[model samples]
Target: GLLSRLRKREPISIYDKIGGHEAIEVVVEDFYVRVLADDQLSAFFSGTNMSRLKGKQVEFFAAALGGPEPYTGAPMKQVHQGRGITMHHFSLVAGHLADALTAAGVPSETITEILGVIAPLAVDVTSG
Candidate 1:
Protein backbone atom coordinates (compact mmCIF):
# COMPACT_ATOMS: atom_id res chain seq x y z
CA GLY A 1 0.00 0.00 0.00
CA LEU A 2 2.71 2.43 1.01
CA LEU A 3 4.81 1.69 -2.03
CA SER A 4 1.96 2.10 -4.41
CA ARG A 5 0.75 5.22 -2.67
CA LEU A 6 4.25 6.70 -2.79
CA ARG A 7 4.62 5.72 -6.41
CA LYS A 8 1.46 7.54 -7.29
CA ARG A 9 2.46 10.66 -5.35
CA GLU A 10 4.66 11.87 -8.21
CA PRO A 11 8.29 12.81 -7.86
CA ILE A 12 9.36 16.09 -6.38
CA SER A 13 13.02 16.40 -7.14
CA ILE A 14 14.73 17.14 -3.85
CA TYR A 15 16.22 20.34 -5.24
CA ASP A 16 12.87 21.90 -5.98
CA LYS A 17 11.31 21.60 -2.54
CA ILE A 18 14.09 22.63 -0.18
CA GLY A 19 15.45 25.63 -2.11
CA GLY A 20 17.65 24.01 -4.73
CA HIS A 21 21.39 23.96 -4.09
CA GLU A 22 21.30 24.91 -0.44
CA ALA A 23 19.07 22.00 0.46
CA ILE A 24 21.56 19.61 -1.03
CA GLU A 25 24.23 21.11 1.17
CA VAL A 26 22.08 20.39 4.18
CA VAL A 27 21.51 16.82 3.14
CA VAL A 28 25.24 16.31 2.57
CA GLU A 29 26.00 17.73 5.98
CA ASP A 30 23.68 15.15 7.43
CA PHE A 31 25.13 12.40 5.25
CA TYR A 32 28.73 13.12 6.07
CA VAL A 33 28.44 12.84 9.83
CA ARG A 34 27.84 9.16 9.30
CA VAL A 35 30.25 8.83 6.40
CA LEU A 36 32.99 10.53 8.36
CA ALA A 37 32.69 7.97 11.08
CA ASP A 38 32.55 5.00 8.75
CA ASP A 39 35.67 3.04 9.68
CA GLN A 40 36.11 1.93 6.10
CA LEU A 41 35.86 5.38 4.58
CA SER A 42 36.73 8.18 6.98
CA ALA A 43 40.06 8.27 5.28
CA PHE A 44 38.32 9.67 2.20
CA PHE A 45 38.00 12.91 4.09
CA SER A 46 41.13 12.75 6.17
CA GLY A 47 42.78 15.64 4.41
CA THR A 48 39.67 17.63 3.57
CA ASN A 49 37.54 19.87 5.70
CA MET A 50 34.10 18.46 6.35
CA SER A 51 32.42 21.65 5.23
CA ARG A 52 34.27 21.63 1.95
CA LEU A 53 33.58 17.97 1.52
CA LYS A 54 29.95 18.67 2.21
CA GLY A 55 29.97 21.39 -0.40
CA LYS A 56 31.46 19.11 -3.01
CA GLN A 57 29.08 16.34 -2.12
CA VAL A 58 26.20 18.78 -2.38
CA GLU A 59 27.24 19.85 -5.84
CA PHE A 60 27.80 16.27 -6.89
CA PHE A 61 24.51 15.03 -5.54
CA ALA A 62 22.65 18.03 -6.87
CA ALA A 63 23.76 17.30 -10.38
CA ALA A 64 23.17 13.61 -9.93
CA LEU A 65 19.81 14.20 -8.31
CA GLY A 66 18.55 16.11 -11.37
CA GLY A 67 18.90 19.68 -10.23
CA PRO A 68 19.71 22.36 -12.80
CA GLU A 69 23.08 22.75 -11.13
CA PRO A 70 26.17 21.39 -12.78
CA TYR A 71 28.75 19.34 -10.94
CA THR A 72 32.36 20.48 -11.07
CA GLY A 73 33.74 17.72 -8.93
CA ALA A 74 35.85 14.90 -10.30
CA PRO A 75 34.15 11.89 -11.78
CA MET A 76 33.57 9.09 -9.28
CA LYS A 77 36.26 7.02 -10.93
CA GLN A 78 38.74 9.85 -11.07
CA VAL A 79 37.83 11.04 -7.63
CA HIS A 80 38.62 7.70 -6.08
CA GLN A 81 41.66 7.24 -8.28
CA GLY A 82 44.28 6.38 -5.74
CA ARG A 83 41.90 5.14 -3.09
CA GLY A 84 41.19 1.87 -4.85
CA ILE A 85 37.54 1.14 -4.27
CA THR A 86 36.87 -2.54 -4.21
CA MET A 87 33.44 -4.13 -4.55
CA HIS A 88 33.33 -4.32 -0.77
CA HIS A 89 34.16 -0.63 -0.44
CA PHE A 90 31.47 0.23 -2.95
CA SER A 91 28.90 -1.83 -1.07
CA LEU A 92 29.77 -0.19 2.23
CA VAL A 93 29.50 3.27 0.72
CA ALA A 94 26.16 2.43 -0.85
CA GLY A 95 24.86 1.14 2.46
CA HIS A 96 26.10 4.20 4.28
CA LEU A 97 24.48 6.44 1.68
CA ALA A 98 21.17 4.71 2.27
CA ASP A 99 21.67 5.19 5.99
CA ALA A 100 22.45 8.83 5.36
CA LEU A 101 19.24 9.13 3.34
CA THR A 102 17.38 7.65 6.30
CA ALA A 103 19.01 10.08 8.66
CA ALA A 104 18.18 12.93 6.32
CA GLY A 105 14.53 11.85 6.44
CA VAL A 106 14.12 11.25 2.74
CA PRO A 107 11.04 9.19 1.86
CA SER A 108 11.59 5.59 0.82
CA GLU A 109 10.33 6.32 -2.66
CA THR A 110 12.79 9.14 -3.02
CA ILE A 111 15.56 6.91 -1.76
CA THR A 112 14.57 4.31 -4.30
CA GLU A 113 14.66 6.92 -7.03
CA ILE A 114 18.03 8.18 -5.89
CA LEU A 115 19.38 4.67 -5.85
CA GLY A 116 18.21 4.26 -9.40
CA VAL A 117 20.19 7.33 -10.35
CA ILE A 118 23.25 5.99 -8.59
CA ALA A 119 23.09 2.46 -9.89
CA PRO A 120 24.68 3.23 -13.22
CA LEU A 121 27.75 4.69 -11.59
CA ALA A 122 28.67 1.47 -9.87
CA VAL A 123 31.11 0.45 -12.55
CA ASP A 124 33.13 3.55 -11.88
CA VAL A 125 32.78 3.32 -8.12
CA THR A 126 33.27 -0.43 -7.92
CA SER A 127 36.19 -2.37 -9.24
CA GLY A 128 35.62 -5.28 -11.54
Candidate 2:
Protein backbone atom coordinates (compact mmCIF):
# COMPACT_ATOMS: atom_id res chain seq x y z
CA GLY A 1 0.00 0.00 0.00
CA LEU A 2 1.05 3.64 -0.50
CA LEU A 3 0.81 3.97 3.26
CA SER A 4 3.35 1.19 3.74
CA ARG A 5 5.77 2.93 1.39
CA LEU A 6 5.20 6.29 3.04
CA ARG A 7 5.14 5.24 6.68
CA LYS A 8 7.09 2.08 7.28
CA ARG A 9 10.82 1.64 6.96
CA GLU A 10 11.48 -0.49 3.91
CA PRO A 11 13.46 -3.72 3.77
CA ILE A 12 17.18 -3.15 3.68
CA SER A 13 19.81 -4.86 1.59
CA ILE A 14 23.22 -5.97 2.89
CA TYR A 15 24.72 -2.70 1.65
CA ASP A 16 22.47 -0.60 3.84
CA LYS A 17 22.87 -2.98 6.76
CA ILE A 18 26.62 -2.41 6.89
CA GLY A 19 26.45 1.40 6.84
CA GLY A 20 26.72 1.75 3.07
CA HIS A 21 29.53 3.37 1.06
CA GLU A 22 31.25 5.15 3.92
CA ALA A 23 31.62 2.16 6.20
CA ILE A 24 32.62 0.04 3.24
CA GLU A 25 35.72 2.20 2.90
CA VAL A 26 36.47 1.69 6.57
CA VAL A 27 35.87 -2.03 6.25
CA VAL A 28 38.18 -2.30 3.23
CA GLU A 29 41.02 -0.62 5.06
CA ASP A 30 40.35 -2.87 8.01
CA PHE A 31 40.44 -5.88 5.71
CA TYR A 32 43.80 -4.81 4.26
CA VAL A 33 45.33 -4.61 7.70
CA ARG A 34 44.31 -8.15 8.59
CA VAL A 35 45.39 -9.55 5.23
CA LEU A 36 48.66 -7.68 5.34
CA ALA A 37 49.38 -8.93 8.82
CA ASP A 38 49.10 -12.49 7.55
CA ASP A 39 52.14 -12.07 5.27
CA GLN A 40 51.76 -15.79 4.60
CA LEU A 41 49.31 -14.81 1.91
CA SER A 42 52.22 -13.15 0.14
CA ALA A 43 51.95 -15.50 -2.79
CA PHE A 44 49.56 -13.05 -4.38
CA PHE A 45 50.01 -10.13 -2.02
CA SER A 46 52.10 -7.34 -3.47
CA GLY A 47 54.45 -5.23 -1.39
CA THR A 48 53.92 -2.07 -3.41
CA ASN A 49 51.08 0.27 -4.38
CA MET A 50 48.84 -0.69 -1.48
CA SER A 51 47.07 2.67 -1.43
CA ARG A 52 45.79 2.44 -4.98
CA LEU A 53 45.06 -1.19 -4.41
CA LYS A 54 42.86 -0.33 -1.47
CA GLY A 55 40.85 2.10 -3.56
CA LYS A 56 40.16 -0.53 -6.21
CA GLN A 57 39.47 -3.15 -3.57
CA VAL A 58 36.99 -1.04 -1.68
CA GLU A 59 34.98 -0.56 -4.85
CA PHE A 60 35.12 -4.27 -5.52
CA PHE A 61 33.80 -4.96 -2.04
CA ALA A 62 31.13 -2.33 -2.41
CA ALA A 63 29.83 -4.19 -5.42
CA ALA A 64 30.29 -7.46 -3.59
CA LEU A 65 28.05 -6.18 -0.82
CA GLY A 66 25.33 -5.37 -3.32
CA GLY A 67 25.85 -1.64 -3.46
CA PRO A 68 24.28 0.38 -6.25
CA GLU A 69 27.55 0.88 -8.11
CA PRO A 70 28.78 -1.90 -10.36
CA TYR A 71 32.40 -2.98 -10.01
CA THR A 72 34.61 -1.35 -12.66
CA GLY A 73 37.99 -2.52 -11.50
CA ALA A 74 40.02 -5.06 -13.44
CA PRO A 75 38.05 -8.20 -14.02
CA MET A 76 38.59 -10.68 -11.19
CA LYS A 77 39.00 -13.69 -13.50
CA GLN A 78 41.69 -11.95 -15.52
CA VAL A 79 43.43 -10.19 -12.67
CA HIS A 80 43.39 -13.07 -10.25
CA GLN A 81 44.19 -15.52 -13.04
CA GLY A 82 47.95 -15.67 -12.87
CA ARG A 83 48.30 -15.49 -9.12
CA GLY A 84 48.48 -19.28 -8.75
CA ILE A 85 46.17 -18.93 -5.80
CA THR A 86 44.25 -21.74 -4.11
CA MET A 87 40.99 -22.09 -2.20
CA HIS A 88 42.92 -22.00 1.06
CA HIS A 89 44.32 -18.65 -0.03
CA PHE A 90 40.82 -17.48 -0.84
CA SER A 91 39.61 -18.89 2.49
CA LEU A 92 42.19 -16.91 4.38
CA VAL A 93 41.17 -13.71 2.61
CA ALA A 94 37.51 -14.38 3.24
CA GLY A 95 38.24 -14.98 6.91
CA HIS A 96 39.93 -11.63 7.24
CA LEU A 97 37.00 -9.99 5.50
CA ALA A 98 34.64 -11.37 8.11
CA ASP A 99 36.96 -10.37 10.92
CA ALA A 100 37.11 -6.83 9.55
CA LEU A 101 33.33 -6.53 9.41
CA THR A 102 33.05 -7.96 12.89
CA ALA A 103 35.33 -5.23 14.12
CA ALA A 104 33.14 -2.79 12.25
CA GLY A 105 30.10 -3.97 14.27
CA VAL A 106 28.20 -5.59 11.41
CA PRO A 107 25.85 -8.42 12.38
CA SER A 108 26.99 -12.02 12.01
CA GLU A 109 24.33 -12.94 9.45
CA THR A 110 25.09 -9.83 7.43
CA ILE A 111 28.71 -10.91 7.36
CA THR A 112 27.65 -14.37 6.17
CA GLU A 113 25.62 -12.93 3.33
CA ILE A 114 28.44 -10.60 2.39
CA LEU A 115 30.85 -13.50 2.05
CA GLY A 116 28.27 -15.52 0.17
CA VAL A 117 28.59 -12.99 -2.64
CA ILE A 118 32.38 -13.24 -2.66
CA ALA A 119 33.08 -16.95 -2.06
CA PRO A 120 32.29 -18.29 -5.53
CA LEU A 121 35.04 -16.29 -7.19
CA ALA A 122 37.41 -19.06 -6.08
CA VAL A 123 36.81 -20.68 -9.48
CA ASP A 124 38.59 -17.96 -11.44
CA VAL A 125 41.00 -17.16 -8.66
CA THR A 126 42.19 -20.70 -7.98
CA SER A 127 41.97 -22.07 -11.51
CA GLY A 128 44.38 -19.57 -12.92
Candidate 3:
Protein backbone atom coordinates (compact mmCIF):
# COMPACT_ATOMS: atom_id res chain seq x y z
CA GLY A 1 0.00 0.00 0.00
CA LEU A 2 2.82 2.41 0.79
CA LEU A 3 4.52 1.72 -2.47
CA SER A 4 1.26 2.08 -4.34
CA ARG A 5 0.61 5.40 -2.73
CA LEU A 6 4.05 6.68 -3.59
CA ARG A 7 3.92 5.35 -7.12
CA LYS A 8 0.61 7.01 -7.70
CA ARG A 9 2.30 10.32 -6.98
CA GLU A 10 -0.83 11.71 -5.50
CA PRO A 11 -1.06 15.12 -3.97
CA ILE A 12 -0.88 14.97 -0.22
CA SER A 13 -1.54 17.98 1.95
CA ILE A 14 1.59 19.15 3.75
CA TYR A 15 -0.46 20.47 6.64
CA ASP A 16 -2.08 17.10 7.15
CA LYS A 17 1.31 15.42 7.33
CA ILE A 18 3.11 18.20 9.20
CA GLY A 19 0.60 18.12 12.05
CA GLY A 20 -1.46 21.07 10.86
CA HIS A 21 -1.34 24.19 13.07
CA GLU A 22 2.28 23.70 14.08
CA ALA A 23 3.53 23.29 10.57
CA ILE A 24 1.64 26.33 9.49
CA GLU A 25 3.40 28.29 12.19
CA VAL A 26 6.78 27.19 10.86
CA VAL A 27 5.83 28.35 7.39
CA VAL A 28 4.49 31.66 8.68
CA GLU A 29 7.48 32.38 10.85
CA ASP A 30 9.93 31.73 8.06
CA PHE A 31 7.92 33.75 5.58
CA TYR A 32 7.61 36.81 7.83
CA VAL A 33 11.27 36.79 8.72
CA ARG A 34 11.90 37.05 5.00
CA VAL A 35 9.25 39.73 4.55
CA LEU A 36 10.57 41.95 7.32
CA ALA A 37 14.12 41.82 6.08
CA ASP A 38 13.18 42.42 2.49
CA ASP A 39 14.08 45.98 1.49
CA GLN A 40 11.83 46.19 -1.53
CA LEU A 41 8.81 44.58 0.08
CA SER A 42 9.39 45.79 3.62
CA ALA A 43 8.05 49.20 2.67
CA PHE A 44 4.54 47.80 2.55
CA PHE A 45 4.74 46.24 5.99
CA SER A 46 6.76 49.07 7.54
CA GLY A 47 5.56 50.44 10.89
CA THR A 48 3.09 47.60 11.16
CA ASN A 49 2.97 45.47 14.31
CA MET A 50 4.11 42.18 12.86
CA SER A 51 2.67 40.06 15.66
CA ARG A 52 -0.85 40.40 14.37
CA LEU A 53 0.40 39.88 10.88
CA LYS A 54 2.15 36.68 11.95
CA GLY A 55 -1.00 35.26 13.46
CA LYS A 56 -2.98 35.98 10.34
CA GLN A 57 -0.28 34.44 8.22
CA VAL A 58 -0.49 31.24 10.22
CA GLU A 59 -4.21 31.07 9.66
CA PHE A 60 -3.85 32.05 6.03
CA PHE A 61 -1.23 29.45 5.20
CA ALA A 62 -3.00 26.77 7.17
CA ALA A 63 -5.98 27.11 4.93
CA ALA A 64 -3.92 27.59 1.81
CA LEU A 65 -1.75 24.56 2.47
CA GLY A 66 -4.66 22.13 2.47
CA GLY A 67 -5.16 22.03 6.19
CA PRO A 68 -8.53 21.41 7.80
CA GLU A 69 -9.14 25.10 8.46
CA PRO A 70 -10.39 27.21 5.62
CA TYR A 71 -9.20 30.78 5.17
CA THR A 72 -11.62 33.34 6.63
CA GLY A 73 -10.16 36.48 5.13
CA ALA A 74 -12.05 38.92 2.93
CA PRO A 75 -13.15 37.80 -0.45
CA MET A 76 -10.04 37.58 -2.59
CA LYS A 77 -11.00 40.33 -5.01
CA GLN A 78 -12.65 42.57 -2.41
CA VAL A 79 -9.68 42.67 -0.01
CA HIS A 80 -7.43 44.55 -2.40
CA GLN A 81 -10.23 45.66 -4.66
CA GLY A 82 -9.08 49.27 -4.96
CA ARG A 83 -5.71 49.91 -3.37
CA GLY A 84 -4.05 50.46 -6.77
CA ILE A 85 -1.07 48.14 -6.19
CA THR A 86 0.51 47.08 -9.41
CA MET A 87 1.73 43.71 -10.68
CA HIS A 88 5.28 44.87 -10.05
CA HIS A 89 4.55 45.13 -6.34
CA PHE A 90 3.03 41.69 -6.43
CA SER A 91 6.16 40.33 -8.06
CA LEU A 92 8.39 41.85 -5.42
CA VAL A 93 6.35 40.30 -2.66
CA ALA A 94 6.33 36.90 -4.33
CA GLY A 95 10.02 36.88 -5.08
CA HIS A 96 10.80 37.89 -1.54
CA LEU A 97 8.68 35.09 -0.14
CA ALA A 98 10.26 32.48 -2.35
CA ASP A 99 13.70 33.68 -1.44
CA ALA A 100 12.83 33.44 2.21
CA LEU A 101 11.68 29.89 1.77
CA THR A 102 14.95 29.02 0.13
CA ALA A 103 16.97 30.81 2.76
CA ALA A 104 15.16 28.84 5.43
CA GLY A 105 16.53 25.63 3.92
CA VAL A 106 13.26 24.52 2.49
CA PRO A 107 14.08 22.42 -0.54
CA SER A 108 13.84 24.13 -3.89
CA GLU A 109 11.05 21.88 -5.09
CA THR A 110 9.12 22.52 -1.92
CA ILE A 111 9.48 26.25 -2.31
CA THR A 112 8.29 26.11 -5.87
CA GLU A 113 5.42 23.88 -4.94
CA ILE A 114 4.28 26.08 -2.08
CA LEU A 115 4.60 29.28 -4.06
CA GLY A 116 2.68 27.79 -6.94
CA VAL A 117 -0.11 26.90 -4.57
CA ILE A 118 -0.26 30.40 -3.12
CA ALA A 119 0.21 32.44 -6.27
CA PRO A 120 -3.47 32.49 -7.17
CA LEU A 121 -4.28 34.56 -4.10
CA ALA A 122 -2.25 37.47 -5.41
CA VAL A 123 -5.25 38.68 -7.33
CA ASP A 124 -6.85 39.47 -3.98
CA VAL A 125 -3.85 40.76 -2.01
CA THR A 126 -2.45 43.10 -4.62
CA SER A 127 -3.50 46.72 -4.77
CA GLY A 128 -6.25 47.52 -7.23
Error of 1 at 12 (Å): 4.7
Question: What would the TM-scores of all predictions be?
Answer: 0.76, 0.85, 0.70
Query: How big is the positional error of residue 17 in model 1, measured in Å on the Cα after superposition?
Result: 5.3
- Local accuracy of candidate 1 as per-residue lDDT tens digits, 21-52: 76676667766777778898888667886766
- Model 3 alpha-carbon drift over 4 Å, by segment: 1-11, 17-19
For all candidates in order, the CA lDDT equals 0.71, 0.81, 0.70
| Candidate 2 C-alpha lDDT tens digits along 28-107 | 89998898889778546666688988888878887776676567678888887867787878899999999999999998
Q: lDDT tens string, model 3, 76-124?
A: 5775667566777777777867776666566788778887987887777
Clashes of each: 0, 0, 2
RMSD (Cα, Å) of candidate 2?
3.7
As a TM-score, model 1 comes out at 0.76
- Name the TM-score of candidate 3: 0.70
Best model per TM-score: 2
Q: How big is the positional error of residue 109 in model 2, measured in Å on the Cα after superposition?
A: 0.9
Is 2 or 3 the stronger prediction by TM-score? 2
* TM-score for predicted model 2 compared with the true structure: 0.85
